[PDB]
Amino acid sequence: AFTLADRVTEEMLADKAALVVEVVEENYHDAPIVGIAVVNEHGRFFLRPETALADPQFVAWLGDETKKKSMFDSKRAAVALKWKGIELCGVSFDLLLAAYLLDPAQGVDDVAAAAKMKQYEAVRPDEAVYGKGAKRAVPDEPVLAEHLVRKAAAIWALERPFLDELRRNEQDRLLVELEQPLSSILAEMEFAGVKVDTKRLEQMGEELAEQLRTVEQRIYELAGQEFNINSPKQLGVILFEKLQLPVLKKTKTGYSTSADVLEKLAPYHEIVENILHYRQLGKLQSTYIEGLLKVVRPDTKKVHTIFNQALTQTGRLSSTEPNLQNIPIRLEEGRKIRQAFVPSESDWLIFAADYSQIELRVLAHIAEDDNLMEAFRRDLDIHTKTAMDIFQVSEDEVTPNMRRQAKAVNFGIVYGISDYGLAQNLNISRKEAAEFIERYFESFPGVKRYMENIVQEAKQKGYVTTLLHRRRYLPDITSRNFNVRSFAERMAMNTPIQGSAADIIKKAMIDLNARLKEERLQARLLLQVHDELILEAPKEEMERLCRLVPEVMEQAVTLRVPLKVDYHYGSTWYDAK
DNA sequence: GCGATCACGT
DNA sequence: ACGTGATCGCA
């Protein structure tokens, strides 16, 4: 029983309400709002969008911070309303973020999955209403209106039990002071978008398509035959059958053609180096040139990513359409793709600030390892210092290969450390990789104590927590399968580190957003990628940002070691180095 | 649509 | 390890 309203009435504008602003298109940027539902003390309402959104009283209510709304995934609605020039304020409860904080492993992606966490099943999953894939379609108004009102009624009913459990978990402030404020900041970042120099991308695409046409022909000559180089199946026939190259590794369904395997194969035939060259070129051309060009809005030449705030098990943000968190940086030929990301206005510049080794600094603090804390208090090169201890040599005796192996141990130490992964990344034996680990724990006994203690805490409590009380349940920590249990143990060690770094970055974003407004700067956040914050700002604001941004980031939280921030700026994302 | 494979950045 | 994405090849 609900009201299919033809007009906005005063009772729909109570100062507390569950609100549903339904955007069915997966990418909500400039997307239709197919319907609105309001549940409050006075009843349940369905409002047609081309009525409420043209009603001054409803729009005023949407934008009044004092009128509190409970929603699911408020950022989706916030952004769709931004594209209509409408401001959404007063969202005091986001059931999506609440369910994500209560248990990220649930993969709660719609109201029904979250309600099922609390034995509430009077709401259908979105996929049952809209179908999936080709069959996906908005249903007739009666069916649509019933779904939206059931979702709003579930949100209405679910706020208290979710807030109660968040409070029992000591996560009430995590939701209200971190994730929900961050949702608004992310909505502004997505809406602003990042300007793309498409002519430069097009220029790069033409060039890659040229080098590809060359390497391709060369491969057809070394193979004495034509074939689809991009088919791992076909390529395996040319390599491990026609050319008789050794089979060093075998995927689950045949021969592996990983760059890992091919590297070891290069000595046997000149084709291998070209196939490797062809694959990097092909990866750039198809994923980063053509892929980026597909998602650039032709009206504004901006990409408007979507930050997924309730996806990872660590609390890190994820990004889609495009995923800007893997634009090439390692290789120079692929690093130049960042030259296409420019300021959205003339005489503006890109400013980029990144935490320096925040994960290892977080580890130092959490493990209270004297050796690790002292290394950062002296602002040492951590990889070089790690090599000095592991190999018991002075700084002058550290060779480039020793530092490379110390760096791999550090990369592993923060991601669990397994032996097979270290041995794999270092192309060494497990016993040798095991020897590296034990030398490391000899040098960093507090890290070893932390790794043992956090595993035991994961087993006793059933979860691990981050600095700001994000938790991750680890049910497989007791499993009797060595592999399933090993992964759970490594997530026990890694999650407090990665998740705490994620907490710090999110808090810095909130602190930076407040400071920029305090200082009345025009600078604005565009992207959070990994441990970096990217802003654009007028060139006249660069000197102030050079002091402001690192200070806010370095003060986001107080650890037992300093937080270091490297920052650069330039006319492009590339040049902000 | 869907599994398998590959690869990119943390 | 976190993921996003693209290509291919079979239903």
Ligand SMILES: Nc1ncnc2c1ncn2[C@H]1C[C@H](O)[C@@H](COP(=O)(O)NP(=O)(O)OP(=O)(O)O)O1
């Ligand atoms: N554990 C982690 N988890 C997620 N992202 C990480 C990370 N560690 C680094 N990133 C990012 C953060 C860093 O800003 C970025 C680059 O640092 P690196 O090359 O990975 N290792 P470093 O800088 O300490 O030693 P060198 O002097 O040889 O460069 O990788």
Ligand SMILES: [Mg+2]
């Ligand atoms: Mg670093």
